[PDB]
Amino acid sequence: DYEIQRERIELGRCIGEGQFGDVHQGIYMSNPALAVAIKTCKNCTSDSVREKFLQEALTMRQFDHPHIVKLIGVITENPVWIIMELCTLGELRSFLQVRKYSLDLASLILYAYQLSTALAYLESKRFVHRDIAARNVLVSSNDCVKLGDFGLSRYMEDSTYYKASKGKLPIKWMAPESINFRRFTSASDVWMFGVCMWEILMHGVKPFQGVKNNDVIGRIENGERLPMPPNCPPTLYSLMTKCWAYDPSRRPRFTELKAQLSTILEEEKAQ
Amino acid sequence: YEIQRERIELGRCIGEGQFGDVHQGIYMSPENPALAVAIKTCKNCTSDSVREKFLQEALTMRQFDHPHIVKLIGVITENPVWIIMELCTLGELRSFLQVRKYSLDLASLILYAYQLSTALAYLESKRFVHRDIAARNVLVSSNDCVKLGDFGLSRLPIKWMAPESINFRRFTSASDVWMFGVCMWEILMHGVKPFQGVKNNDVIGRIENGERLPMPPNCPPTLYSLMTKCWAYDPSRRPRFTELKAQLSTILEEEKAQ
Numbered sequence: 001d002y003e004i005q006r007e008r009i010e011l012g013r014c015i016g017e018g019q020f021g022d023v024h025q026g027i028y029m030s031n032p033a034l035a036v037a038i039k040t041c042k043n044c045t046s047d048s049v050r051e052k053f054l055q056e057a058l059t060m061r062q063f064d065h066p067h068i069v070k071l072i073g074v075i076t077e078n079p080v081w082i083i084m085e086l087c088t089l090g091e092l093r094s095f096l097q098v099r100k101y102s103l104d105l106a107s108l109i110l111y112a113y114q115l116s117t118a119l120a121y122l123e124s125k126r127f128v129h130r131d132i133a134a135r136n137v138l139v140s141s142n143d144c145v146k147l148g149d150f151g152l153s154r155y156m157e158d159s160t161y162y163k164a165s166k167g168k169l170p171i172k173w174m175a176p177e178s179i180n181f182r183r184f185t186s187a188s189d190v191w192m193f194g195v196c197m198w199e200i201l202m203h204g205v206k207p208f209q210g211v212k213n214n215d216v217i218g219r220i221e222n223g224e225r226l227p228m229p230p231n232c233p234p235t236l237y238s239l240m241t242k243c244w245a246y247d248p249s250r251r252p253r254f255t256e257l258k259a260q261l262s263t264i265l266e267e268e269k270a271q
Numbered sequence: 272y273e274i275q276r277e278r279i280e281l282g283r284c285i286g287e288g289q290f291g292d293v294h295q296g297i298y299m300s301p302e303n304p305a306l307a308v309a310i311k312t313c314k315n316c317t318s319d320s321v322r323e324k325f326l327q328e329a330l331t332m333r334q335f336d337h338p339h340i341v342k343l344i345g346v347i348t349e350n351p352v353w354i355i356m357e358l359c360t361l362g363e364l365r366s367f368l369q370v371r372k373y374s375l376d377l378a379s380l381i382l383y384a385y386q387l388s389t390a391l392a393y394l395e396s397k398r399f400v401h402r403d404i405a406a407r408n409v410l411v412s413s414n415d416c417v418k419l420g421d422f423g424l425s426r427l428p429i430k431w432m433a434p435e436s437i438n439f440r441r442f443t444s445a446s447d448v449w450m451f452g453v454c455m456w457e458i459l460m461h462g463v464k465p466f467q468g469v470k471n472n473d474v475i476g477r478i479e480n481g482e483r484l485p486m487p488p489n490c491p492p493t494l495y496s497l498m499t500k501c502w503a504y505d506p507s508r509r510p511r512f513t514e515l516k517a518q519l520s521t522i523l524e525e526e527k528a529q
């Protein structure tokens with residue numbers, strides 16, 4: 001059981017918003033002052049909303065990986081809260097932007113490698129993430145990145161259903177079979193990981209800048225692909241282009257991606 | 272991959288495939304003057320469609336290179352059209368397990384399940400769905416070596432199929448894991464078939480009601496727990512071949528230590 005008493009939580013400032021409501025930072029008095037992320041649920045007095053929200057905690061509870069945010073616990077009494085591990089250094093895109101001159105290439109490859117370990121782990125549990133993008137990656141330390149909460153990562157996908165959402169469908173990250181037929185598989189996750197690796201090597205710059213979402217599929221179906229980032233090792237760019245094979249059966253699996261990223265990281269650290 | 276006919280000595284017929292008899296033979300080449308081979312023949316290869324379908328079976332095998340999958344040696348495109356495959360000298364696994372029933376040690380049975388998991392992890396790495404994983408499709412190269420046989424020769428097996436395959440004709444990497452679970456059960460059962468006495472039409476009802484194949488006599492409990500994971504009704508709850516291979520390696524080490 002992972003039920004937590006509310007008195008042990010000090011609710012701090014709002015750090016973002018999810019589909020169910022504001023996400024706050026806070027402190028969990030367990031150590032007596034652990035930093036946490038707290039998902040809140042504005043419509044949780046409705047049984048169906050409460051079930052959908054608590055299912056997001058059940059989803060995270062099944063995973064245990066060094067590069068995925070951990071579920072700390074739940075408060076099932078109103079207001080219903082989900083307590084997650086806080087990654088103290090924040091969002092990966094902002095972190096890479098601040099260090100666009102500071103961070104070394106070996107650190108960028110390390111983050112792609114750590115993410116491939118988390119994704120090989122999800123693949124081993126037959127879990128399809130659906131939104132592998134730098135926006136859904138957090139920074140725990142200078143040498144550690146983690147995939148953020150999975151419910152919160154579906155914010156862009158879910159934006160089509162929420163009139164007040166600031167989000168937009170993540171077309172620029174999606175595999176063609178996902179855009180065309182709404183098929184989400186372990187192979188479509190590999191395509192998205194390729195785009196995520198491109199974002200990291202680009203220091204948090206978004207893919208297809210200036211291109212309208214509606215114009216993405218036509219470019220991809222005409223054979224267009226994201227260019228090699230400046231300073232990206234050619235072996236790493238060849239890996240990204242394999243992730244973007246139009247035929248999903250031609251894309252590598254995460255076991256091979258992790259092994260190849262480990263070799264690329266070793267070769268970079270050696271020079 | 273073209274081979275000259277006189278460089279093949281056609282021996283005895285060892286089985287039959289959809290296109291015709293399969294023979295054992297000898298291939299003489301500068302690499303090996305007397306390599307033992309399996310020869311797939313094609314009785315109606317004068318028909319263009321039959322010839323194309325037959326040669327596609329060689330193309331399928333040509334893309335794979337694994338120690339536990341039979342290798343394609345080459346093809347003879349001139350009539351009669353032949354496909355030359357690596358020979359597994361000890362024959363079919365089911366017959367082999369039946370003969371050596373009292374002879375074979377438990378560690379050997381676990382080794383065969385392990386070697387098959389390495390071949391299947393390799394197919395999974397290339398996103399290839401086999402669809403016909405069963406002891407009938409496994410051959411014996413030596414006392415310490417098994418291989419998946421020709422994929423064309425390997426072509427309803429209701430008693431081996433995942434429920435989503437029976438119900439909706441969905442064949443995925445997860446349905447291959449379900450079949451591999453049944454294959455491991457067959458090996459530990461010394462080549463006995465699953466669900467003996469049950470009509471094919473009655474299998475799905477049993478499966479839906481939570482029934483599963485029982486723990487074979489002398490099967491280590493850790494190995495039976497692995498088989499029961501392969502038979503999770505929800506395909507997303509089934510393990511992948513990388514985990515199966517790692518777990519089978521541990522089970523094999525524990526058995527070899529005794």
Ligand SMILES: CN(c1ncccc1CNc1c(C#N)cnc2[nH]c(-c3ccccc3)cc12)S(C)(=O)=O
Binds near residue numbers: 023091136
């Ligand atoms: C971007 N994501 C979010 N999406 C919507 C709302 C809020 C977030 C940030 N969530 C987290 C989580 C989770 N789960 C863990 N640690 C965290 N640390 C921080 C943070 C720390 C310092 C400064 C700024 C942000 C946020 C944060 S995610 C990765 O969860 O999909």
Ligand SMILES: CN(c1ncccc1CNc1c(C#N)cnc2[nH]c(-c3ccccc3)cc12)S(C)(=O)=O
Binds near residue numbers: 358361362
């Ligand atoms: C069972 N299979 C078959 N199905 C139909 C016809 C023939 C076979 C056996 N084929 C082989 C192969 C292939 N491919 C390789 N080595 C082989 N050695 C033998 C053999 C050796 C000695 C005695 C009896 C058989 C057969 C054989 S399979 C696994 O290929 O699907």
